[PDB]
């Protein structure tokens, strides 16, 4: 449900600082980002909009899309 795909740089750097920024957001338990896949598995509290986290990543200067497939 809440696993997004990263596009604005997927390598092992952005897929880590994004995790940091994500985990810095209250309501986030774990941001399971995978660089060799380009996937962000967000373990957030229900209620936190997926598009909001995606927007947070977008506002982080990177690009992601809420796409569970």
Kindly list the residues in this chain that would bind Hg ion in the complex (CB under 5 A).
9, 11, 13-14
| Residue with smaller CB distance to Hg ion, 7 or 29 | 7
Q: How far is the CB of 16 from Hg ion (least distance, A)?
A: 9
Q: Minimum distance from CB of 8 to Hg ion (Å)?
A: 8
Helices (H), 1-69: 14-23, 50-59
What is the b/e burial string over 18-37, where b = at least 16 CB atoms within 10 angstroms of the residue's CB?
bbebbeeeeebeebebeeee
In the complex with Hg ion, the residue whose CB is nearer, 13 or 41, is 13
DSSP for residue 21? H
Binding residues for a metal cation: 11, 14
Binding residues: 11, 14
């Amino acid at each position: 449900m809440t696993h997004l795909k990263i596009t604005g740089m997927t390598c092992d750097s952005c897929a880590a600082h994004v995790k940091e920024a994500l985990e810095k957001v209250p309501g986030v338990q774990s941001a399971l980002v995978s660089y060799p896949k380009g996937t962000a598995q967000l373990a957030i509290v229900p209620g936190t909009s997926p598009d909001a986290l995606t927007a947070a990543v977008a506002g982080l200067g990177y690009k992601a899309t809420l796409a569970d497939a």
